[PDB]
Amino acid sequence: GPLGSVRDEIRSMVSDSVDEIVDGVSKTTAEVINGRKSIAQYATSLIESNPEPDNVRTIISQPLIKNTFLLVGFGLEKDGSNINNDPSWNPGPTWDPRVRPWYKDAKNAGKLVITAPYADSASGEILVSVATPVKDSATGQFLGSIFYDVSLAELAELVNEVKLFDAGYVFIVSEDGTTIAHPKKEFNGKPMSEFLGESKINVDTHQVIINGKPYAVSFSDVEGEDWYVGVVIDEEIAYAALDE
Amino acid sequence: GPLGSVRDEIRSMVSDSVDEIVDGVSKTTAEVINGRKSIAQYATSLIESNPEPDNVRTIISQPLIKNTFLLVGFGLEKDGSNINNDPSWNPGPTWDPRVRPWYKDAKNAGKLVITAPYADSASGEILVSVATPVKDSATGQFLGSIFYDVSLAELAELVNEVKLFDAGYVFIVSEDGTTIAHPKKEFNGKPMSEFLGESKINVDTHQVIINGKPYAVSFSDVEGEDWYVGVVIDEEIAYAALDE
């Protein structure tokens, strides 16, 4: 039969509970992301002060860096050489950093950016990178760019700390609805409509039907990036968890 | 019956509820602290790699360091000289880092430590410092210690993000009861018995005589230091909110 009698009050408590999850995780996410950008910028400044390869290796090979990012690499405009923090890393024999998304985004913007999701050269896996240009301290000339890789699997884990008891999940999308981080990596870098049905962001908690079932969906902006933290919650389970 | 039992329940809930607040904050807090410790270790490793004063200044004068810590200074064992990140800082005409607690604590521990509260030489204010020793990379000899100053006021501000709807406040203490951080800086460095009445730490929630009056008080350990986060809330106002 149908879902039966449902308190117009309890389903506003759910509506607000959802708003609260997204708003809070979005603050949390902005802080963690800001933290990692700050570490990237510091390393980059140290490198600019003296970009000798041995100095670069020292700066990027410390535990803090190796623990904060998947991989770090500084590509040179001059010859497409690179200095990186993982001797096991092989992006391929003819790889030129100068053509890559992290490199071009940092060059094009002349400042620190985080890339849209893109396919890793070595593994093909989708990730993002913090990326920064490196300028000649004397002349201001562009010398190359540095990437700092960020695991989307790990971002997904981070935003799903919140305890939802299989009632729903948290994810991250960009302003245009491209998925930044989903519990199912298969969606990373794809339109959020692939799992939500809807393609456009509507921040206010609202009902969405997915395979015939009602879900409460809400979003909240992330300060510092054109990103939103989103949540999708089985409305029936949510209502039921509460009712009781 | 309906009164005794109901009251016992609300009191058991108000207990738990309060234990919860500080269990959370003791996790948030360790997160922040471990973050600041990792930055200090990072900068120290880079300094040990090349402790020439110009390189030291470059490392400790970047915005990440300037925004993470109140002040940073490397005190030298050879002559008591120092390299610091604020040319306007002046600890006085007869200051020697080698008799200061941050310096000795790091020299003795032979690794990274945080100090107990102490009085800042320049300003008199009560603070703590992350402190690290510096070794000559060629001979292993002790070269000096570095301090990275932590604002206790700002720490109080942090633990008090928590919305207590003005019914109480959060604070930090060390094992022996010494106040690490209190919303009123006058208590920093003092026995907690001064604002609680209680001189000894009891983690599980409980009632406390202060102005011959009842507030709820719980402690949760902080992972990584011999510290505890603590809370005090109005039991009357507490009870009322869990009751309704």
> How many C-beta neighbours within 10 Å does residue B54 have?
11
Instruction: Establish if B49 touches chain A: CB-CB under 8 angstroms.
Output: yes
The resolution of the experimental structure, rounded to one decimal in Å, is: 2.0
Cα A198 to Cα A174, A178, A193, A194, A237: the distances in Å are: 14, 12, 5, 8, 21
How many angstroms separate the CA atoms of A166 and A48, rounded? Answer: 47
Give the list of residues 6+ apart from residue A131 with CB closer than 8 angstroms, or none.
A102, A103, A105, A106, A112, A113, A114, A115, A145, A146, A147, A148
Give the list of residues 6+ apart from residue A122 with CB closer than 8 angstroms, or none.
A89, A90, A91, A92
Domain boundaries, chain A: 1-38+152-244, 39-151
Structure tokens at B235: 């039991």
**Which architecture characterizes domain B39-151 according to CATH?**
2-Layer Sandwich (3.30)
8 Å CB contact of A46 and B39: no
Q: How many residues does chain A have?
A: 244
Identify the CATH assignment for B1-38+152-244 out of 3.30.420.40, 3.40.50.2300, 3.30.450.20, 3.40.50.970. Answer: 3.30.450.20
* Phi, psi of A226, rounded to the nearest 5 degrees: -85, 55
Give the list of residues 6+ apart from residue A124 with CB closer than 8 angstroms, or none.
none
Structure tokens at B167: 């019914």
How many angstroms separate the CA atoms of B176 and B166, rounded? Answer: 28
> How many C-beta neighbours within 10 Å does residue A34 have?
14
Is residue A210 helix, strand or coil? strand
Q: Which positions 3-42 of B are in contact with A (Cβ < 8 Å)?
A: 35, 38-39, 41-42
Q: What is the b/e burial string over B25-49, where b = at least 16 CB atoms within 10 angstroms of the residue's CB? A: bbebbbeebeeebbbbbbbbbbbbe
How many angstroms separate the CA atoms of B100 and A149, rounded? Answer: 41
Torsion of CA A175, A176, A177, A181, to 10 degrees: -60
How many angstroms separate the CA atoms of B204 and A201, rounded? Answer: 45
Which positions in chain B touch A35 (Cβ < 8 Å)?
Answer: 35
Q: Which residues of chain B form beta strands (DSSP E)?
A: 72-76, 82-84, 113-114, 118-119, 126-135, 142-150, 168-174, 179-181, 207-209, 214-222, 227-234
Q: Distance, in angstroms, between B67 CA and closest chain A CA?
A: 10
Instruction: Establish if B140 touches chain A: CB-CB under 8 angstroms.
Output: no
Amino acid at B234: D
- Residue-by-residue DSSP string for A10-66: HHHHHHHHHHHHHHHHHHHHHHHHHHHHHHHHHHHHHHHH---HHHHHHHHSSHHHH
Instruction: Establish if B63 touches chain A: CB-CB under 8 angstroms.
Output: yes
In 3D, which of A94, A44, A95, A101 has the Cα closest to residue A69? Answer: A44
Structural biology method used:
X-ray
Half-sphere exposure of A164 (CA within 13 A, CB side): 25
How many angstroms separate the CA atoms of B240 and B113, rounded? Answer: 43
- Which of B42, B59, B62 lies closest to A64 in CB terms? B42
Is residue A164 helix, strand or coil? coil
How many angstroms separate the CA atoms of A155 and A33, rounded? Answer: 10
Q: How many residues does chain B have?
A: 244
Q: Which of B46, B130, B132 to mutate to test the interface with A (most CBs of A within 10 A)?
A: B46
A1-38+152-244 and A39-151, same CATH topology: yes
**Chain B residue nearest residue A50, CA to CA:** B55
Contact by Cβ (8 Å): A133, A110: yes
How many angstroms separate the CA atoms of B97 and B55, rounded? Answer: 20
Q: What is the b/e burial string over B202-228, where b = at least 16 CB atoms within 10 angstroms of the residue's CB? A: ebebeeeeeeeeebbbbbbbbeebebb
Contact by Cβ (8 Å): A203, A218: yes
Contact by Cβ (8 Å): A118, A38: no
Rg (CA), chain A: 21
